[PDB]
Design a protein around this ligand. Structure first.
Ligand code: GLC
Ligand code: GLC
Ligand code: GLC
Length: 310
């Protein structure tokens, strides 16, 4: 039961976006209904990645205790996901203070994972932990390389062998993969995110400032495919050198991009990842990058097939 076998269990997955990583669940548009996981399994996904903003559910002061009600909610969500025979990834996501002052908030992340690891320690091996989403800014490659092992150390005290996913630093952009220093732990998976070209995938996304213009195409030209292949080969050669499996944790193009381009970009990214033995998770389930319409109760096609491969 090696890290590579567990990586294959992640397989082709999907992110439950705009839910538990909002300040409050539902305030970004998605409340996780129990049936969503049955719906996700039924379509053919192997896994679900669940972004969680734990940092908005803890006391301001030490020992940064996680709200009991929030913790039981997450427990319930995990329970239902696992009962639907999915692999489940829970993370810490959008810890804004960590990006600004990691020397101060690094110990807070440790305490958060102390508590989450303790609550989930007896869960089946199909639940994975992911220490942090997209280290960046003040949480530099170097500080991340210092911080993550300490959180991992803490996790290992109660969960000796559970799969733990380590994000690439600098927003987990592919090109920073070589900056990540690896530990001796043999039950880890390295994760990067892919949104290239950013002016395609995030065109018209109001949350980017300035808002990128729309009308950007992705056409599947040989040169366009090759861009993607070269980026992933770079991740691939590093990973093989270091004997670590790779998880493409997020990839997607915003719905304000033209559908034809989205289908081509999405299917190309998925195929290239499969080619390098990367597991993957589409961003995201049902909102602005979404594959599933909650109201019409239908998966958008062929985009969903482009994301999933079936
Ligand atoms: O990543 C942050 C933002 O992403 C997207 O814009 C979501 O629609 C929004 O809910 C969130 O504020
Ligand atoms: O979630 C934060 C996002 O925007 C950032 O600029 C990163 O470069 C990108 O990898 C990520 O998707
Ligand atoms: O969908 C809203 C945004 O924030 C999320 O955390 C995603 O990771 C990123 O890809 C996107 O830009």
């Amino acid at each position: 039961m090696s890290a590579f076998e567990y990586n294959k269990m992640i397989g082709h997955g999907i992110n439950m976006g705009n839910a538990l990583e909002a300040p409050v669940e539902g305030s970004w548009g998605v409340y996780i209904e129990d049936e969503y996981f049955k719906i996700i399994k039924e379509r053919g996904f192997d896994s679900v990645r669940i972004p969680i903003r734990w940092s908005a559910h803890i006391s301001e002061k030490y020992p940064y205790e996680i709200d009991k009600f929030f913790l039981d909610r997450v427990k319930h969500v995990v329970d239902v996901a696992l009962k639907n025979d999915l692999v489940v990834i829970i993370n810490c996501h959008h810890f804004e203070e960590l990006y600004q002052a990691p020397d101060k908030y690094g110990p807070v992340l440790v305490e958060i994972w102390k508590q989450v690891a303790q609550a989930f320690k007896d869960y089946p091996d199909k639940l994975f932990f992911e220490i942090f989403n997209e280290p960046a800014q003040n949480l530099t490659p170097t500080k991340w390389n210092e911080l993550y092992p300490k959180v991992l150390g803490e996790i290992r005290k109660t969960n000796p062998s559970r799969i733990v996913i380590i994000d690439v630093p600098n927003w987990s952009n592919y090109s920073y993969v070589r900056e990540l220093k690896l530990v001796d732990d043999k039950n880890i998976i390295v994760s990067f995110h892919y949104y290239e070209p950013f002016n395609f995938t995030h065109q018209g996304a109001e949350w980017v400032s300035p808002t990128l213009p729309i009308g950007v195409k992705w056409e599947g030209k040989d040169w366009e495919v090759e861009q993607i292949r070269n980026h992933f080969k770079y991740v691939s050669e590093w990973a093989k050198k270091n004997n670590v499996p790779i998880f493409l944790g997020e990839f997607g193009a915003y719905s304000k991009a033209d559908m034809e381009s989205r289908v081509k970009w999405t299917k190309t990214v998925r195929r290239i990842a499969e080619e390098f033995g990367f597991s993957l998770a589409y961003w995201e389930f049902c909102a602005g990058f979404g594959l599933y319409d909650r109201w019409t109760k239908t998966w958008i096609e062929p985009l969903t097939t482009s994301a999933l491969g079936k």
